[PDB]
Design an enzyme around this catalytic site. Structure first.
Site, PDB file in Angstrom:
ATOM      1  N   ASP A 173      -9.184  -5.530  -4.964  1.00 54.72           N
ATOM      2  CA  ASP A 173      -8.872  -4.430  -4.016  1.00 54.72           C
ATOM      3  C   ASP A 173      -9.888  -3.282  -4.211  1.00 54.72           C
ATOM      4  OD1 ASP A 173      -7.665  -2.521  -2.286  1.00 54.72           O
ATOM      5  OD2 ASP A 173      -5.653  -3.315  -2.786  1.00 54.72           O
ATOM      6  N   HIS A 177      -7.562  -6.014  -0.408  1.00 55.41           N
ATOM      7  CA  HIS A 177      -6.392  -5.164  -0.079  1.00 55.41           C
ATOM      8  C   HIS A 177      -5.336  -5.966   0.683  1.00 55.41           C
ATOM      9  CE1 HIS A 177      -4.134  -1.579  -0.003  1.00 55.41           C
ATOM     10  NE2 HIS A 177      -4.200  -1.411   1.328  1.00 55.41           N
ATOM     11  N   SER A 208       0.850  -1.218   0.000  1.00 55.28           N
ATOM     12  CA  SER A 208       0.000   0.000   0.000  1.00 55.28           C
ATOM     13  C   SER A 208       0.883   1.265   0.000  1.00 55.28           C
ATOM     14  CB  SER A 208      -1.013  -0.068   1.110  1.00 55.28           C
ATOM     15  OG  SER A 208      -2.000   0.907   0.861  1.00 55.28           O
TER      16      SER A 208
END
Ligand SMILES: [Cl-]
Ligand SMILES: [Cl-]
Ligand SMILES: [Cl-]
Ligand SMILES: [Cl-]
Ligand SMILES: [Cl-]
Ligand SMILES: [Cl-]
Ligand SMILES: [Cl-]
Ligand code: NA
Ligand code: NA
Lengths: 840, 844
Positions: B787, B819, B709
């Site tokens: 995601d 995610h 991320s």
């Protein structure tokens, strides 16, 4: 023994330089011949066509003047004349509406600009899509012939969204038709009046609750049956009623996609992060509910549209024709006496050709009393006529050739030409006479007719052609019929399965077949409707394409033996580049004694006593022939680039591939993947034995779509043959592909569990290599044909099996790579993968 | 001098990863949580309390409702292990195959819930009523109160419904536990749990066939509120009943947020049923685009003596929310005063630099009507002295972090002031507790007249503001952290970093006579605590880098005349620490001072069986974004086992908490304001070079950067800006274009695109692909296909740019992952892929 050749290692930027340097036009097509009728002028014809000349950036409408006289010892190169004055037909950035973009995908159109036009010869009207709208121009007829380009005129509309599939009314060229928001419209091009004919599409806010269309070819029809229209103009006007109004008619397919499964595919505007919804009938699931209907409108003397009417079959389509799953084709007899349709069953083992008289259709109404009154008034002698039936234990290939002859007054028969493959296992021309005898039906009394109910006796069925070769009847191939000389012109493989040729035979006294094209080339021909001249677009493996015009010359009393006299060139062959080396065609007999053809790109600057790393380039699926005597350097330049680095490139047309008859393609029935890989391996081993420069320790298998499927099948079943596989847009699970294609070759999943399981490479991942760098997967993210799902599912299975893989995505590509920068990246990626991982 | 990692076959690497996880010596999510202490009412019996909680016992596959008996006496030199008792008899709470509804699945993603079974319960202590979601439905059971305490597990009772689709966010009515509320099809409902009667309160959602034409919801937290403001509810029960009807009826009240998402952009994300080849539609506010239109409203209903729901009313602010509060973009939080006299809300402006705490009296809300004459009559009847009160305002040139701590003390009748506790960070740059007294006086409004608020409209004078805590450390006020207030002893219990930024501790201070802060937890561990509402005991869930977590129960003991100095006494264990596994070697924490003299903390996983004079290939493991601290004294082996695995193969693993990371105050995280990407890599490189100098076993020619991320973003930024430092980057779920991320997060740290074009451009790695390597095998991208947070689009756009720039890349996708990687097979494949990439490409 032989030394092992090592391809030179390059940096990534070195490979970019080789690809970019390697890549250091659309021939005239869609011809209309128009006779010039002035004795003093030096031209016999104007020839109209689409083309992109060298200085142009798009496909546009062009013409060439065909002279009355040419010099014997001098080559006339015809000038391409622009019809349209400084006119950009391509929308901004070559970004089409979703409707036009998807039609271009279904038709495999890559070129920008005008890709089709309608022409009405008597009026000289041209009608075409351009610049997100509809345009027209006029040339010939009463206005005369232009000598410089004209501005085309936009047709104004009050309609919202695209006007698709525009066609000129044959009987009255003041009128044209189009599809807007899933309904059929007509307009008067002179007055600007528009009128909606069909009212299927309610225009509901939720599109999923609005599942009917009129005049539209649905997804499977466009992708798997090569039909891009759902409506057909009646060629004649009629005069029913006492008011003397002119009636114009359109046959149309109405569809209901309610029960068809919905899938979502990402849209090309990636930054919007949205999908388009598709009615995608996966194998074994529901196809659309279909019916043929008739749209009518009436016009007065001033061309005003006075009335419109939807008409439906007096008894439902599903009652009259209960085993019909698909309408393959439809049209009219030239007098408009009968609509006709080609119907297929769901197994695609049974085809019927059916005549439908307009009197069998009654006005659509909610009033039960009016409907019954209409049904009761249908004459008892009116009915469908099944004039031909084709049945097979393999599958029906839809052949486009059906030519009904005019009937005489009082004559209860129809004579027609028909291409038929199921009779002998090779596609041949037959002259058929059907008897049209009325049984007598009370159409107000519902009944359940069987399949034989409307079947016509066959009085005569004459083979005009025969033998172990094919008449070409698919993907643009057609016949041309001269009713004055009783000759039919057709294309075929009679000389060799490696070349398409033009032939002529009598349909009156079937005998000698005359070849009209030059042997040693594969030809794509367009014939004048006056049978005075024709164009051939042709090439060979060694020679880039040319476009030549021929005059049919000699005594009028001997029409079968007219000479195809070379007249003029529209395009001379481009020079063969010095760094291009054509592949070599070979053939061999398998252990089962089947003849297979192949091609080999020999390593450039080949030295004796050396074995080279080899790419087996594979497609291997039905309806494609990769190996023929035509120029490969435009479409397959990348295979020459591989050979220039010292890779041998092998191509094998194994059983299942086309232009070899039904039994040859029938080998893969219900077992896709199985015979194809055996033939690829036999071919590779034959090439190694005959040529002696193949390093069988360093073979990569590479293909796209069916070729990606077979690349994976190769690595799964023949891991000692194939060092690496590069699988582009692979089919990985047949249960995710469509009805029209998958069921034809594989049946429905419930009927062929073994074949679906054996043919689905994503179910065999445990057999893929436990060594890294043997498998590269490539896929366009926007693919609406072989969904990105196939790669996602394969990856999900590879993770579950603990297998390594390499992956490349083309985020902005559908089923093919169209962007030149992405094409180069793909080729660089392939060169890098081979240099690192095909070498030991 | 250069250490070479042993090369393994792919199946060899699979065996190493499989062995590492199977024989980890640790078990994921074994800790009991969500504690409720209930006093027992039997003087003869041996137990002081029943302790209720959620847990997954050793012989279970799911979280259920459990209890343990707290004994009155324990032996001092003896360790009591509390018996975990089932409340529920052979009850499966997890739906078939662990496949939740889309609504429950996405809520679990927003809440970062991985465990199966009951993940939350509502409890009404006076009645002993438990209310919870299980098996695609609503269940309840009763224990304690009038019913007595169960001695064996009971069957929970399903609550029947005539509603279609899920009943979400269920809550017991505090004033009357015969009633509960839920959300159904984006509207607020109430029901009588005893009679089974249901009643719809709000009528926002029309139920149109096209959902995009049906854009209003009531009682629902929208995507950015759940993902970026940690709020999962849009409605709040008034804690009191009223009797203002002239028919003997009782009025119950619910404050709720109404939203209109009409103007919010729609995106499509693939659904987890891959074979269906479909997407779900999300109202996803990208940075610079429209957030939902919002308003606070009041739902009221009347009940008779039989518990029948007699009548309902939707009420709205007498002047529109947008007129009264024109600079409000977000409702961060809301609730009520304990007497029900005021609803309150925490309002944020769009720049998130201005917060207001506002009281809203119920009399400010009038019946919703289409009748203009009735509306005007209602507006004219609002008393002149009824108004909003802004009781507190927080303003900053950095950003407001939403702190959950607001404790209003009940007012006396006729008192024109409000006393409250508030956590405030913007005042000093460190989150601290204040006791505030605001003056609530009205000069009067005609609410029937059109309204344009001035500067400081509704602003209350502050009579008094006492700092209860102060210093260069934080009170923890976010992500589950709370205060506990004992109004009898005038003590507030809180958690903070007073001892060290590396450990969370429990503290107590007086709010009456603010002075000495007493620590209740043991130094050398980081603690997560739950205090009894009788302040007689607490639970600590704690660990250190070297010791796996334990859960212990403590008694607060000593003289009642000295409540501040009550001693924490070990009472019993809910869960003993596993031993540190023998092949797990804990990382070592260090700190250094940057060239700018900022203190940064880091941790090092030393290569196992380290030999002197050897330089090892190194993995810099990075997150580096706001709201996260990777380096603290808590056990890392459950979440970060893979870093031990890398060290066991002979990789050095380095982690640096650079500027922008949390638990160091507002100035420290504020360094990345409007320039995300820029300061973070400088600090990572200074840390890496510090470790190389101090420890001497770092091969600076063989450093990989890896994160997920924000960490995937910084992995790419590292390879772009420091290509001589980082030989390879492995970027997981990277943010590649800040213009594609959401309003709540991106605007807080970066402003809108139109106000910070340079910062957005510099911080979007997909716009700098020309600077990524022209050499193969230096970049591996990983992304979950599903995601819904960092859209797969970020990877797809990065790939599109890499193709246009003629750059090589390697790619892995997780088709079945959102995610984070939740499937063990995908987690192992990820780790094997990483080991193979490092062995082939980090080595020369
Ligand atoms: Cl399409
Ligand atoms: Cl060999
Ligand atoms: Cl093999
Ligand atoms: Cl294997
Ligand atoms: Cl202590
Ligand atoms: Cl570079
Ligand atoms: Cl995992
Ligand atoms: Na064929
Ligand atoms: Na902080």
């Amino acid at each position: 023994p032989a030394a092992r050749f090592q391809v030179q290692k390059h940096s990534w930027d070195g490979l970019r330089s080789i690809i970019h340097g390697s890549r250091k036009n659309k021939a005239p097509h869609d011809f209309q011949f128009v006779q010039k009728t002035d004795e003093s002028g030096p031209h016999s014809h104007r020839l109209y066509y689409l083309g992109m000349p060298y200085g142009s950036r798009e496909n546009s409408l062009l013409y060439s003047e065909i002279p009355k006289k040419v010099r014997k010892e001098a080559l006339l190169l015809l000038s391409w004349k622009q019809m349209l004055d400084h006119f950009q037909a391509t929308p901004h950035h070559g970004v089409y509406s979703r409707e036009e973009e998807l039609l271009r995908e279904r038709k495999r159109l890559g070129v920008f600009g005008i890709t089709s036009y309608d022409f009405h010869s008597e009026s000289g009207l041209f009608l075409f899509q351009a610049s997100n709208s509809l345009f027209h121009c006029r040339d010939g007829g009463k206005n005369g012939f232009m000598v410089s380009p004209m501005k085309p005129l936009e047709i104004k509309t009050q309609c919202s969204g695209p006007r698709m599939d525009p066609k000129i009314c044959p009987a009255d060229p003041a009128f044209f038709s189009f599809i807007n928001n899933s309904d059929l419209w007509v307009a008067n091009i002179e007055t600007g009046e528009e009128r909606r004919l069909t009212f299927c599409h309610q225009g509901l806010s939720n599109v999923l609750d609005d599942p009917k269309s009129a005049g539209v070819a649905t997804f499977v029809i466009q992708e798997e049956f090569d039909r891009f229209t759902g409506y057909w103009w009646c060629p004649t006007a009629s005069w029913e009623g006492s008011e003397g109004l002119k009636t114009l008619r359109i046959l149309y397919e109405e569809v209901d996609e309610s029960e068809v499964e919905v899938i979502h595919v990402p849209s090309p505007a990636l930054e919007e992060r949205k999908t388009d919804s598709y009615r995608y009938p996966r194998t074994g699931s529901k196809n659309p509910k279909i019916a043929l209907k008739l749209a009518e409108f009436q016009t007065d003397s001033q061309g005003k549209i006075v009335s419109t009417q939807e008409k439906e079959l007096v008894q439902p389509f599903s009652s009259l024709f209960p085993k019909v799953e698909y309408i393959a084709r439809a049209g009219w007899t030239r007098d408009g006496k009968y609509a006709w349709a080609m119907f297929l069953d769901r197994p695609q083992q049974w085809l019927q050709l059916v005549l439908l008289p307009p009197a069998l259709f009654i006005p659509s109404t909610e009033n039960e009393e009016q409907r019954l009154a209409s049904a009761r008034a249908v004459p008892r002698n009116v009915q469908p006529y099944v004039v031909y039936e084709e049945v097979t234990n393999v599958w029906i290939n839809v052949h486009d050739i059906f030519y009904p002859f005019p009937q005489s007054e009082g004559e209860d028969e129809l004579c027609f030409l028909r291409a038929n493959e199921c009779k002998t296992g090779f596609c041949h021309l037959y002259k058929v006479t059907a008897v049209l005898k009325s049984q007598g039906y009370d159409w107000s009394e519902p009944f359940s007719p069987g399949e034989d109910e409307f079947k016509c006796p066959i009085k005569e069925e004459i083979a005009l052609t025969s033998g172990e070769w094919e008449v070409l009847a698919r993907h643009g191939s057609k016949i041309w019929v001269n009713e004055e000389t009783k000759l039919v012109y057709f294309q075929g493989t009679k000389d060799t399965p490696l070349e398409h040729h033009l032939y002529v035979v009598s349909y009156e006294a079937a005998g000698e077949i005359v070849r009209l094209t030059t042997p040693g080339f594969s030809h794509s021909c367009s014939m004048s409707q006056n049978f005075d001249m024709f164009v051939s677009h042709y090439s060979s493996v060694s020679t880039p394409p040319c476009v030549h015009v021929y005059k049919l010359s000699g005594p009028d009393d001997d029409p079968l033996h007219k000479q195809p006299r070379f007249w003029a060139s529209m395009m001379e062959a481009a020079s063969c580049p010095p760094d291009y080396v054509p592949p070599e065609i070979f053939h061999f007999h398998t252990r089962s004694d089947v003849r297979l053809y192949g091609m080999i790109y020999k390593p450039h600057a080949l030295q004796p006593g050396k074995k080279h790393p080899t790419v087996l380039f594979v497609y291997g699926g039905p309806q494609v022939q990769l190996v023929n005597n035509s120029f490969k350097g435009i479409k397959y330049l990348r295979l020459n680039t591989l050979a220039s680095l010292g890779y041998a490139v092998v191509v094998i047309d194994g059983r299942g591939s086309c232009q070899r008859g039904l039994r040859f393609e029938g080998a893969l029935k219900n077992q896709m993947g199985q015979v194809e890989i055996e033939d690829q391996v036999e071919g590779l081993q034959f090439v190694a034995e005959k040529y002696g420069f193949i390093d069988l320790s360093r073979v990569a298998i590479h293909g796209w779509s069916y070729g990606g499927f077979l690349s994976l099948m190769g690595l799964i079943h023949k891991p000692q043959v194939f060092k690496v596989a590069i699988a582009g847009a692979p089919v990985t699970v047949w249960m995710a592909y469509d009805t029209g294609y998958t069921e034809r070759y594989m049946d429905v999943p419930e009927n062929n569990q073994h074949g679906y399981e054996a043919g689905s490479v994503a179910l065999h991942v445990e057999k893929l290599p436990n060594e890294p760098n043997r498998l590269l997967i490539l896929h366009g993210f926007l693919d609406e044909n072989v969904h990105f799902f196939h790669t996602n599912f394969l990856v999900s299975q590879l993770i579950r099996a603990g297998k390594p893989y390499q992956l490349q995505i083309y985020p902005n590509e559908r089923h093919s790579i169209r962007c030149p920068e992405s094409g180069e990246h793909y080729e660089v990626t392939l060169l890098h993968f081979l240099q690192e991982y095909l070498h030991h």
